[PDB]
Amino acid sequence: LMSLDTALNEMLSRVTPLTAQETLPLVQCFGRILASDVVSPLDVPGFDNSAMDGYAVRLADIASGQPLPVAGKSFAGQPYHGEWPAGTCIRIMTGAPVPEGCEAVVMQEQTEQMDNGVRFTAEVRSGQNIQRRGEDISAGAVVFPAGTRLTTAELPVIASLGIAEVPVIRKVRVALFSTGDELQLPGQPLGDGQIYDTNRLAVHLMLEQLGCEVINLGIIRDDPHALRAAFIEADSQADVVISSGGVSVGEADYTKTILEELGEIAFWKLAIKPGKPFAFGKLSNSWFCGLPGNPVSATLTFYQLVQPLLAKLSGNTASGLPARQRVRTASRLKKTPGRLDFQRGVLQRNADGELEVTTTGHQGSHIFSSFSLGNCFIVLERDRGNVEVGEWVEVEPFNALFG
Amino acid sequence: LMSLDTALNEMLSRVTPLTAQETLPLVQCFGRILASDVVSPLDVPGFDNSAMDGYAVRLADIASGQPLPVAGKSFAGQPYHGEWPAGTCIRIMTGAPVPEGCEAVVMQEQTEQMDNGVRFTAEVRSGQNIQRRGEDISAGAVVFPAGTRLTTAELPVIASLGIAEVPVIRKVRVALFSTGDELQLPGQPLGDGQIYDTNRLAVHLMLEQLGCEVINLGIIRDDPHALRAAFIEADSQADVVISSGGVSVGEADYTKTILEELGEIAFWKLAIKPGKPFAFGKLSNSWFCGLPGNPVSATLTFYQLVQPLLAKLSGNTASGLPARQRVRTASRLKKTPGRLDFQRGVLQRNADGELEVTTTGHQGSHIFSSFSLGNCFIVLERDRGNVEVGEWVEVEPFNALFG
């Protein structure tokens, strides 16, 4: 009934990214979000330097048509600062500063080393293979803007500017619980009708991998006052509160009325498969997400709804979730018009060399095994029907949460 | 001269995967390697249960095509234990135990109701939508084998068996250092030829994200006795010792001769670009990986050589490098025959739904920016030459280390 894009736009339009910040050493910044633009204090490189290894040379000692001896070297930690004679050259490695006077660097293309000097094939009237001070990064330049998630790609650059620490948005704090007399902790004997609580673990793990600070209140007992207080304490310590199962997703009961009293919660029926119900809304100081009890539905609903919400809250200006690509199915898929269906599939390269998807097996939500067997979602359009072999299909590779 | 495949295979062929273990609670096992088969202690489901949301019925009631009053519900924590009279059906959710005597489950979808009961609108077949005990998982069956990397796909399933903790292989321990008077720490000012140490941070970050325990010994004093003491410390504490800059990769000097004293180290020249030199071999109780000093080179060598080594050492039975897919370039690529070139590109969706690659721009090892702008490697074949727009090319998406 409610479309996914509509639900997702409803959620995101209402959220304000976090701004509270903290300053941490670079080694601690993996996956953290820059709170402020990193502006370079220095020129990179610090002085004119070589882009390649070979030899630094001059104007007229190449126009003289004769060989040029190696009068010294420059490695970057040992620059050449000698007396730098007339018709000679200076051996140079990549990133090493050019000696004073140098006007060109020649690679290992046009160098023939001899007894009496190096010989060169072409000439030049310019700074070939010279990085000028600040060609890469100029001082006062914005190297990375606020909102950038920091990775191995960005943090070493920041280290090359001489910066020990950078400001980052604080972690989104997420409180998590389940409730119901039927739920039991793994490692404890099941009582008569009981089942093991798995949703809560799944969400905790996904939360920690996403970079959130997690507050797991456990299983709250079937008691109005205990649930109300769990709600009150979670809301007062977290930016987001998640019921991983047990709180109403629409049905009338004592939990729904706790929701009515502590917040403004909407109960949606989404046009997705698997899944349908989702609760969402504002508490006094946090955003609430309520997931359905079925593990497949909860995990999928967390992955396609809650994850983007958390990305936006963290201050990240990229986006969560991977990008989709169009691929051929090598399997007949059964799809029923009316719901956007996130099937699980196996994306593999055929012998032709091209990527194709294949189903994992049964797509029913009575089993969980499709997530470890598959490596992607086949995202099949709401009004699409059955899908024959060879048709084109949208495919969303699993991110790190699932391997 | 020596190919990457040969070098890779000499590295891994020598390596014994770790076996010592520890037993952790599931919430602490993400990314950890299972030390032994998880063997199911039970049948899943423990009782014939429904594959579908709908109604549980008997074939004789369906054969009297009279609408059937709902006598009760079975949900999942709350099975139906009342009396189930002739002419009625039972409301049933996915996962819920099927009630005694039920011969079939009819999905909600093929079942429109009346004022006087549920009308079953399609053919009902024996056994339909019922998952029988043990059919998902069988008691005594291996659910996950030793060597499996645990993730959200797996841990919740383990939780559903009532198992609270599992044996996982101890973390790989990796010692790390660099040497050079030219190397400076952040915040410290930069003397004549000096640079900020960036490789060591890059490697540290990458090691932690791969789940290694890291022992970062800093910048080692520029003399043999200090260097000798670094190796003794590293080697007693670690499974892998890594020099991120400053220890010889073939140049004769006091580090080369210490390396040669403390181990059997080969110094390879590798038919790759960026990069080429790599140091590798056996210390008393650890493996040694020597990286070259250039950042683009050290990162690439770490990614394509050291990362697969750690994955094997860890006990993982899967690859930790992403798979390659075959794609068209939307860019002309400069490529010299003789070296296997791991260029960086930007894989993207064109307007016609097609994935193609674009160059990040300049591919010289004099700047580090290609790792940020990029999202993949273009792995151009050793013997291949320049490449034209439209041509097919192998492409390997960046893993989580670069976003």
From Swiss-Prot, chains A, B:
Ordered alphabetically, the record's keywords are: Magnesium, Metal-binding, Molybdenum, Molybdenum cofactor biosynthesis, Transferase
Q: Which Pfam families match?
A: MoCF_biosynth, MoeA_C, MoeA_N
GO BP annotation list? Mo-molybdopterin cofactor biosynthetic process
Q: Name one GO cellular component term.
A: cytosol
What's the protein name?
Molybdopterin molybdenumtransferase
Entry GO MF terms: identical protein binding; metal ion binding; molybdopterin molybdotransferase activity; protein homodimerization activity
Keyword Magnesium on entry: yes
Q: Give the cofactor note text.
A: Binds 1 Mg(2+) ion per subunit.
Q: Per UniProt, what is the name of the gene that codes for the protein in this document?
A: moeA
Q: Which reaction does it catalyse?
A: adenylyl-molybdopterin + molybdate = Mo-molybdopterin + AMP + H(+)
Q: Which CDD domains match?
A: MoeA
InterPro entries with a match to the protein in the record: MoaB/Mog-like_dom_sf, MoaB/Mog_dom, MoCF_biosynth_CS, MoeA-like, MoeA_C_domain_IV, MoeA_C_domain_IV_sf, MoeA_linker/N, MoeA_linker/N_sf
> So, what pathway does this thing act in?
Cofactor biosynthesis; molybdopterin biosynthesis
Instruction: Report the function annotation for this chain.
Output: Catalyzes the insertion of molybdate into adenylated molybdopterin with the concomitant release of AMP.
